[PDB]
Design a protein around this ligand. Structure first.
Ligand SMILES: *[C@@H]1O[C@H](CO[C@@H]2O[C@@H](C)[C@@H](O)[C@@H](O)[C@@H]2O)[C@@H](O[C@@H]2O[C@H](CO)[C@@H](O[C@@H]3O[C@H](CO[C@H]4O[C@H](CO)[C@@H](O)[C@H](O)[C@@H]4O)[C@@H](O)[C@H](O[C@H]4O[C@H](CO)[C@@H](O)[C@H](O)[C@@H]4O)[C@@H]3O)[C@H](O)[C@H]2NC(C)=O)[C@H](O)[C@H]1NC(C)=O
Lengths: 79, 233, 98, 94, 107, 97, 80, 108, 94
DNA sequence: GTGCCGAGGCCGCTCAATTGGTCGTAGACAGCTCTAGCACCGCTTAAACGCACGTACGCGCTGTCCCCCGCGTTTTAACCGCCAAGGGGATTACTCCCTAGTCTCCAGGCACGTGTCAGATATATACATCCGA
DNA sequence: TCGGATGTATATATCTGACACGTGCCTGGAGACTAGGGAGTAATCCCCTTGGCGGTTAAAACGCGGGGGACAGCGCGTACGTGCGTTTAAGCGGTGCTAGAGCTGTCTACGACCAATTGAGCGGCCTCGGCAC
């Protein structure tokens, strides 16, 4: 299960271009993959905790929204 | 209006064409108290795209003191032409607003298609519409009484008059902090209470309260200006 | 054999992707990664589509902001190339790895 | 089917007040509803903390006004305070 | 009884005063809630909604669009200093980012 | 005529001030500054001693953290001297700008 | 009324030394004074708002603690 | 009646279960507060206090001092990863800072 | 004067249980009291939000456990959960 | 220019908001009181301020070459349109056990009083460390 | 690479004030009930989640060429750290005044609560034009 490589180098390059980055080093992609993995781990852990507390086997959008809001990353558009 | 805010007999409602340059009404007809009461307790006239200016100022302006009545909107637009002001589209471009070019675009901008046809018939192109006419023909802003162009112009001018004034009351060194706090408690209702014989006066935002006695209070409840901060020792 | 300068197409992409609102990461790989990560907390988990979409939006916004901060850090060091030390410095100052 | 309430009708009414011709999309409605709920929760929590600090059991207009002054930045707080004061005065009159 | 009249109509607003009052009463904020608090809260919410909606409509008009999409909301929020300060830690879905390129990166 | 090389006394002061817990800003000037700032918000405002002390502690901690971030920023640029640009970059990244 | 100069250059140098700074530029002091003034303005404004809501004329330490907690700077040891 | 026993004594806790229950009931948290919530909360608070006090006492012993001052609390908080994460945005009065100097600034 | 309660004597008992010889000062006691109050407020607020999210009007031990898991990081959450479960089981046994 | 799917408009209906009275308690107000914050005043004196020097460092210029960008080609799997099964979210009814509420009372916790022992403050000494020679 | 010389940690006296213990009191937590409704537990419905398949083609991977920018020297001025002499309010300690924070007693009016009524808004269903193609 190696799915962190699913975030390809062109995708990271596109995300950097949206951020105004002109030139990218070759070692940036691994660092970005690690940062994304850490962020997703935290958010998903909080969402799964919220889901278990609700006695459910399905992760809903409200759980993710609450998990993001708990981290000071309020997200608008999903409830 | 009299002390009870009722119509004051005789002549409770006088046509405007009979009050222009008439100081004898101020002198011999009870002074300024009824006039201030009428100003405070009478609704203004709403600006609608089919009701712009009344016929008193449009047909009979300064009728008594002139050989013929004047036309105030016509005078406004003739003065704009005399001053050599640019047209409606130039000022829309100046304020950063879209400039209509056809009758459909002008109708969309004005939100009144029939008014757009009338303006197109009179002028022929939106670039030639006079500044006053285009400004007063625009739909009013929410909680406002001017269009986006007029609001832009007036806001810019008053921002310049405020920031460019050295003796602005909020500027440091003009008034002391205690004096500024004392001045922050003033109100036109309090001035009217102090300087006239009117004892019942509209509440806060005197420019909004217009119906007696729903938005009127007693003059004694208004806080007074405390001048003790002006004492020099 | 018309070849652009090594900086023209990068600026063109910067202008193109700063004017759009789409998602820059393919949806299926991100969904697979999210499921793989969630496998570490609770087995036999089901995900709503809106949940995965919200996770993707949050991750993309976070990465874009981090890359803006990283660009600021790189420009501070008199450079135009984005380097991992810039990312580490940005994460420290933000308070993430601090 | 249960009934889910949201600030969609009121946001649409305000939009028609501001932009009679311009319409709105579904995602824009969702964002508007989330924003309204978030601001409501922030102001209510600040007012509740203000009431708890002063040992009061009642949330009044003063607590809401102080919470608005504390949270909303710059001229936004002043304008919101003026609008709320006008609304409260109008309601008290009627 | 007399004909019913909504409290929002009495206060001259369009946001629901009664719904806000019910949410305050059942939201575990205080033991009691005053009668003027819902009116003030509804007025503030309506003012903020009107501000952001007006800015978003202006942004949509600047793009020659008839409808408001989340991109217009993001453009309205991020271009206003006070709204940006208020919604600083808030992510708007499908909002994009403000077009901004650093000067040093230009040719 | 003995003389220490430039930098030794700086490290000595770093080691001395990272060990003590005393406040590094004079109390009376900070009290005067706090009163001058608070004058813009209210007249005849009275301050508790604990209020001024808490303000001083919070301000000193905030400035120390800001200087740590500034030192990191200056070191990132291959420098040992902190500059206002480092402070501005740190405050931007923190989000205070 | 120029009390911002009461935060002398040696005090800023001491604060930098506590932060681990070895060398300090000459223009750092004005930037530090401005940052301190901004931070104090925000905190004191919030504290004065809290005091005014309480119908009090004395700013207590608890108001400062509440203000700092509002900015996200919870302070321990003063009040509670 | 009978000899009154504190609810903390039944749970083997040194923290007040009754005071925590009263604070939960009057804290505008929820309409109803269960019977087992105060015990759980008191136990969690007692564990956290015991851990932080153990670390602070260890730091004070390393400093050959008997009484605990805020400097020891700051050292204990900042020298533990979990406690530092829990108290990242918290300023401890009279705590100072952890002694560190960058390697490049070192004389060489 | 009036009675102002704090977690001082309980903190002293815990310290005596951990370190039977060392003492504590007044400022350290104030810091510990503030820390206890802050953690109490955090956990109670998280439990209240959890109860509101699930449309429940009761704060139970499960809500407190989930709040502890959400706030306390790493091994702290596990150890606190173990201690709380042990205390609840002991209390309900007697 | 196309058209189609999402925004806009219309109709049940039902539950939530409105209207009309009571109760009791939370909050407003007047009064006393006695902390505690504010305003002089003198003396050290520690710290701030001013200044000269020189040396380490910030900044600019130059050359390498290697690492990253741009483009063509091939491969890969993302993406999209249907199809099916079914696990599980969501709603409904019964009831019972858990929690709010109340009178009694008594003991744990808080305010006050005090003394002595950890701790803050000189002092001479022994090193710890740094800088030419 | 060693002598002086500057700074700092250390062991030893020496006051000292605040932390820990003891005591009186009071008020809130516990004991023993009653009442009611929140939710726990089954049961059922359908929906949206997952797995599968195949066809298009958009995109990712790979390789090659080249240029420009990251990085290492090298120099040069300059400005900041270090040390010394002069100045200045910071701090300490006492003294006096009174402003206002806090507690106490009365009282009233305002929000919670309850019952009856009805219409506002929510879901379902068309319908057409704003916008993606
Ligand atoms: C053709 O050029 C037109 C003029 O171009 C000018 O000259 C060229 C060479 C460029 O330098 C160009 O930038 C110049 O503007 C151009 O029309 C211009 O459009 C701009 C942008 O919409 C207008 O500026 C706006 O003006 C008003 C008023 O503010 C100004 O005037 C007052 C008084 O003089 C000053 O105090 C101000 O500082 C400004 O000078 C405002 O409506 C607005 O500012 C507010 O709005 C914007 C967004 O709405 C906010 O970002 C701001 O913060 C403010 O809230 C703008 O400043 C400019 O007036 C107008 N010029 C003229 C002469 O009409 C046009 O677009 C070009 N045509 C095409 C097809 O490109």
């Amino acid at each position: 299960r190696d799915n962190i490589q699913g975030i390809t180098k062109p995708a990271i390059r596109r995300l950097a271009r949206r951020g105004g980055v002109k030139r990218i080093s070759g070692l940036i992609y691994e660092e970005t993959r690690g940062v994304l993995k850490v962020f997703l781990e935290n958010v998903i852990r909080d969402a799964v905790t919220y889901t278990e507390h609700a006695k459910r086997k399905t992760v809903t959008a409200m759980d993710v929204v609450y998990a993001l809001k708990r981290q000071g990353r309020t997200l608008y558009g999903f409830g | 209006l009299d002390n009870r805010y009722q119509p004051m007999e005789p002549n409770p409602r006088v046509p405007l064409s009979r009050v222009f340059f008439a100081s004898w009404r101020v002198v011999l007809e009870g002074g300024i108290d009824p006039i201030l009461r009428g100003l405070m307790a009478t609704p203004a006239k709403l600006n609608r795209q089919n009701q712009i200016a009344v016929d008193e100022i449009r047909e009979r302006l300064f009728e008594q003191v002139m050989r013929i009545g004047l036309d105030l909107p016509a005078l406004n637009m003739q003065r704009s032409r005399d001053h050599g002001l640019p047209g409606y589209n130039a000022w829309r471009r100046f304020c950063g607003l879209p400039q209509p070019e056809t009758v459909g675009q002008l109708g969309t901008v004005l939100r009144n298609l029939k008014l757009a046809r009338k303006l197109m018939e009179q002028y022929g192109t939106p670039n030639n519409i006079d500044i006053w006419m285009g400004g007063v023909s625009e739909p009013l802003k929410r909680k406002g009484r001017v269009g986006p162009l007029l609001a832009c112009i007036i806001g810019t001018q008053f921002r310049k008059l405020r920031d460019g004034d050295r003796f602005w009351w909020e500027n440091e060194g003009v008034f002391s902090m205690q004096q500024r706090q004392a001045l922050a408690q003033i109100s036109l209702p309090r001035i009217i209470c102090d300087n006239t014989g009117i004892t019942t006066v509209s509440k806060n935002n005197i420019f909004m309260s217009n119906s007696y006695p729903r938005d009127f209070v007693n003059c004694s409840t208004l806080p007074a200006l405390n001048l003790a901060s002006w004492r020099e020792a | 054999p018309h070849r652009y300068r090594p900086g023209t197409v990068a600026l063109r992409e910067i202008r193109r992707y700063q004017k759009s609102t789409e998602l820059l990461i393919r949806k299926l790989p991100f969904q697979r990664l999210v499921r793989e990560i969630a496998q570490d907390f609770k087995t036999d988990l089901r995900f709503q589509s809106s949940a995965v979409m919200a996770l993707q939006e949050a991750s993309e916004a976070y990465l874009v902001a981090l890359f803006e901060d990283t660009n600021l850090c790189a420009i501070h060091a008199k450079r135009v190339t984005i380097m991992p030390k810039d990312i580490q410095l940005a994460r420290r100052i933000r308070g993430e790895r601090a | 089917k249960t009934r889910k309430e949201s600030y969609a009708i009121y946001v649409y009414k305000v939009l028609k007040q501001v932009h009679p011709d311009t319409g709105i999309s579904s995602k824009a409605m969702s964002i508007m509803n989330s924003f309204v709920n978030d601001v409501f929760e922030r102001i209510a929590g600040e007012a509740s903390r203000l009431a708890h600090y002063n040992k009061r059991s009642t949330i009044t207009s003063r607590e809401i006004q102080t919470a608005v002054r504390l949270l909303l930045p710059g001229e936004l707080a002043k304008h919101a305070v003026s609008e709320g004061t006008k609304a409260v005065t109008k309601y008290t009159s009627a | 009884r007399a004909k019913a009249k909504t409290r929002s109509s009495r206060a001259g607003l369009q946001f629901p005063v009664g719904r806000v009052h019910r949410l305050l009463r059942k939201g575990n904020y205080a033991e009691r809630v005053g009668a003027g608090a819902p009116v003030y809260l509804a007025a503030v919410l309506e003012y903020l909604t009107a501000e952001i909606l007006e800015l978003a409509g202006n942004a949509a008009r600047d793009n020659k669009k008839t409808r408001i999409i989340p991109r217009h909301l993001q453009l309205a929020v991020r271009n206003d200093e006070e709204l940006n300060k208020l919604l600083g830690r808030v992510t708007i879905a499908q909002g994009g980012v403000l077009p901004n390129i650093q000067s040093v990166l230009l040719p």
